Design a protein around this ligand. Structure first.
Ligand SMILES: [Cu+2]
Ligand SMILES: [Cu+2]
Ligand code: NA
Ligand code: NA
Lengths: 621, 621
């Protein structure tokens, strides 16, 4: 059995039992995170060893714990009481969905604010919004959530159409106290509904769309073995799933001839954060770490055939733990399929008389998640020619506010009275590299302009330069689109037939990075997001660019602490962390539900192969 | 009948006759360019008036002519003798394909160079390479081609595998003289073949690709009327085709309710150039204006069903003129089809209980062309949500050279002895804008970072700024990826329901622009390529960013001369010219035939609509 197989229900049940048999999963405990650990380096000689890591919350007020269990052996490997003021609070619990609303609904300050605005408390929705760290000393070491009000006129109404601006509240979840209620003044609650299934708003539905049918009469070209091992068009990999990160790809490798050549050891989106750029005190604290605070895998959607994934789809249904250690399946949570991708290569040659055309295809591994108002699709693609790409598709309903009557430098107008504060959605892809094995290095490659003169008399020459990043202190890099900057991951000990080191080149989109002031709380807690590329030396405990416990953690955790080790990354086992995001000034067209927008990156082989790896693709039938 | 219909064979035949009946199409003339003119502004009240513009070469040595004919009336509208030293030489003629090779094959200098290298002249291929303008005074006012040698070992061999470096020749086409033969010394001719259909190089073909079948059982959702008018999912447009530009889109408009709203009056790729960055004198002159010198429409491929365009495809077969004024059809030269495009919009709402997913689709209008070694696919896409995108797909065989034995700062290695000089492929999209009509303006929009302090105490705020480009002298703009720079085209006299001007935002890829030294010949002749965005006031004679006659034209023509008029572009009939390109350092994986790489741009509505324009899309069946 593969040590990279997906967690089974049985494994989750055994963890529950171990935590029970060991006395750590009392009646008052809540599992905030549970996931299988990857195998340790080299340990994979040939021997079963499945360990799970668990974060356990306590609703009675006692200290939470981080616990690692071996399900193979039925033993607790380590169990540590956490001091949350020091190392952070645990991820937001699904059970806290309704708690902020419920606590506020009996608070006299909250009720006074709603009553001033003539709002029926039974119609006021409030989400568990993450708190971050600001000026409130009472919050240090307490599990805090904040709450903003949205009115639902009726149970199926879109509450996002009706934000209640000028009002915010904070809650101590464990003590069940409302610590603060802030009311900066009355803003009109936007009146129009945003019900995108109401015929009065949609108009008559189009009758003009004729079907598009995608079928595979002989079935798909990939195989799935051991539950999650994929083999497709020379690619080999394992599809993992973690409640925090979502779909993770392991052991990405390409069969070049009769050699299985590793490329990427693990690829994941290790963090994703949505910082808001509205300086109103009602929202200026808001930065939603969808991955690190909320856990994007936990909220993976069940994907409907013909609707979310079209064509011949093979599904995985990953198993996660609920708060009590009971396994539950996310039915049809991962889609896997191959797609036609246009022309692969084409040439019509006058001299030889040969006309040649080949088609491309990609293998797609995807999931969709929902975090509050946002819905995101995470797509990994593998192409015939060796290209690897990630794409995020951002949709959902935009987070709303009032639109101030004098306009705004930080909020856009969507409908009368209705605003959308500016924000970014910033991802971190953690790519544990293994180009032809683990001995890798990273070079930054810039185009080089040349001056007209001796050696270049016609002033046409241009060139390239590559700079090796040798130590972590040197490996925090920024984009330079104007100079075509890319980063090449190579194996200095593996050469192609031309005696050049094999490599892959990362092509970024060069979108803006984190816009916040560098002195801000968010710049400190999401320091990864301030730079496009970081390279670290692999360590098994360096998993997330924001650290292990993101919720209410002080600034400084994660990448900026890791790289202080200033380790050798020149021909070593290294990890690339690429920051990329969308900067969103919402448009009227984003309302009442937003069309998908995209951001991502790709890696293309760069002298990895000895010639095109797709000369054996046959002409299409 | 629509004045924007494609030229018919009959129209071409009538032009031939007029040029004949009028005495301008003697036996010794060669048509180098022929195309229908667009209708003049406002002239389209309701009245037939089809005019054709023709460039006529003379092989006897007399002066060439530019001629405009009315086929509606059977009259010559204007006919002007050209002084080519002043206004440029005429586009390269298809009949010159073999002339450089033929002239060189009897030249004693050329033969001496081949004999030194033991090359059989009958196996040496030479292309009509464009000359540009350099230090050779004898070339001013003469029609010159240059020639580089490639060996074909047998008639179906790929000559690109066997470049003969150290050797170049220039030819006066009309006088049939070889003006110069330059031999800088012997480089080994690369030995390996690049025959990507030879089983010894491809290996056994893959048997693993299972079919992907895309069908439309009720046919396509678009209609085609009047030969080239498309109606699809609220979009309305006319598909044109010109021998220089290729596919051109006219009258792009969107039916919002019961109003047909114009968006773009004409969209085309008005120039595309491939400058080379190798300072060797064997190649340092080479810059191929695939559009302006060679005419990309002329070489549009006939596209094979199931191979080049997959699914339910409607073809156009555009008619062009041969050198003698005879019409000829490019059978199946344009593909039109709709494609599924993933998720359009999706949200799962906990409060309302509503789960909503919709799928996107795009209308595709495409052609593929071949210019020597290059093959490019030009794709225009229209999406349901109002997005317009262009994508170029670059493939073919890379232009080769020797690989110098000491390595190179300007050439990459592909195979033993075989190099590929560095180059760029740079496009200019000419977008004659008509956002809600012709009264338009352009703003440059940058993200605005804000300092932590009063009004922004938590240091989270960020904003945007828009700067109106008011006159042409101000409208030559560069990218700023780091600040998320985009350009918005709006109609200041047309407001959406929120009282904001309707607009579309151009999102560029922010790839490097022209790398050559600013003092270079190519920087002067392709000045457009040195900046990402230009805005001009519409003029019917301002068609190409490089001017009308690109071949051997001195520096200075086109956009930099046009914008010297410093015209008002603030709420006027304007044209956006966007430069975008690929910078290519060829990889081993590009050899012996290159996988497709892409570049392009898109425009998305920005307060053009009063809310999402896709709320009436129904759930998929
Ligand atoms: Cu957003
Ligand atoms: Cu190229
Ligand atoms: Na590694
Ligand atoms: Na215009």
């Amino acid at each position: 059995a593969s040590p990279f197989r997906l967690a089974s229900a049985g494994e989750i049940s055994e963890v529950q039992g171990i935590l029970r048999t060991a006395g750590l999963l009392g009646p008052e405990k809540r599992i905030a995170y549970l996931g299988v650990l990857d195998p340790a380096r080299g340990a994979g000689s040939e021997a079963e060893d499945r360990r799970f890591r668990v974060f356990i919350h306590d609703v009675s007020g006692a200290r939470p714990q981080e616990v690692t269990v071996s399900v193979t052996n039925g033993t607790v490997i380590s169990a540590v009481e956490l001091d949350t003021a020091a190392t952070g609070e645990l991820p937001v619990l699904e059970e806290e969905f309704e708690v902020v609303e419920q606590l506020l609904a009996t608070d006299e300050r909250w009720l006074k604010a709603l009553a001033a605005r003539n709002l029926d408390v039974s119609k006021v929705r409030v989400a568990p919004l993450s708190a971050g760290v600001f000026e409130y000393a009472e919050e240090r070491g307490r599990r805090i959530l904040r709450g903003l009000a949205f009115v639902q006129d009726f149970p199926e109404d879109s509450a996002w159409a009706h934000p209640v601006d000028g009002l915010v509240a904070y809650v101590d979840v464990v003590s069940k106290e409302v610590t603060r209620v802030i009311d900066t003044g009355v803003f009109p609650v936007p009146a129009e509904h945003g019900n995108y299934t109401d015929p009065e708003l949609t108009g008559p539905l189009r009758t003009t769309q004729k079907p598009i049918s995608i079928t595979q009469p002989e079935g798909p070209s990939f195989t799935v073995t051991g539950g999650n091992h994929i083999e497709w068009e020379k690619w080999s990999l394992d599809v993992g799933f973690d409640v925090r990160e979502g779909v993770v790809l392991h052991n990405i490798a390409f069969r070049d001839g009769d050699r299985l050549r590793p490329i990427i050891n693990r690829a994941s989106i290790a963090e994703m954060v949505v910082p808001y750029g509205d300086p109103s005190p009602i929202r200026s604290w808001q930065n939603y770490f969808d991955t690190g605070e909320y856990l994007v895998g936990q909220y993976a959607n069940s994907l409907e055939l013909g609707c979310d994934c079209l064509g011949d789809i093979t599904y995985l249904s990953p198993v996660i733990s609920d708060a009590f250690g009971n396994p539950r399946e996310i039915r049809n949570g991962i889609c896997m399929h191959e797609e036609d991708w246009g022309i692969l290569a084409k040439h019509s040659d006058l001299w030889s008389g040969i006309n040649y055309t080949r088609r491309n295809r990609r293998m797609v591994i995807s999931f969709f998640t929902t975090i509050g108002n946002y819905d995101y699709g995470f797509y990994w693609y593998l192409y015939l020619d060796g290209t690897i790409e990630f794409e995020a598709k951002a949709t959902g309903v935009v987070f709303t506010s009032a639109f101030p009557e004098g306009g705004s430098d930080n909020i856009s107008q969507l409908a009368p009275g209705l605003g959308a504060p500016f924000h970014q959605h910033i991802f971190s892809a953690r790519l544990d590299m293994a180009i032809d094995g683990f001995t890798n290095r990273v070079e930054e490659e810039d185009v080089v302009r040349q001056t007209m003169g001796p050696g270049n008399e016609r002033g046409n020459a241009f060139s390239r330069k590559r700079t090796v990043l040798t130590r972590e202190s040197e490996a925090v890099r920024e984009a330079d689109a104007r100079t075509g900057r890319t980063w090449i991951i190579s194996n200095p000990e593996s050469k192609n037939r031309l005696n050049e080191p094999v490599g892959y080149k990362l092509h970024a989109h060069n979108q803006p990075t984190l816009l916040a002031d560098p002195g801000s709380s968010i710049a400190r807690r999401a320091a990864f997001a301030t730079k496009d590329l970081w390279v670290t030396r692999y360590a098994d405990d360096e998993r997330y660019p924001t650290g292990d416990f993101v919720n209410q953690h002080s600034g400084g955790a994660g990448l900026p602490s890791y790289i202080a080790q200033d380790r050798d990354i020149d021909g070593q086992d290294i990890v690339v962390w690429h920051t990329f995001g969308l900067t969103h000034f919402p448009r009227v067209e984003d309302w009442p539900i937003m069309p998908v927008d995209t951001v991502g990156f790709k890696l293309r082989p760069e002298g990895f192969f000895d010639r095109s790896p797709v000369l054996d693709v046959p002409a299409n039938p």
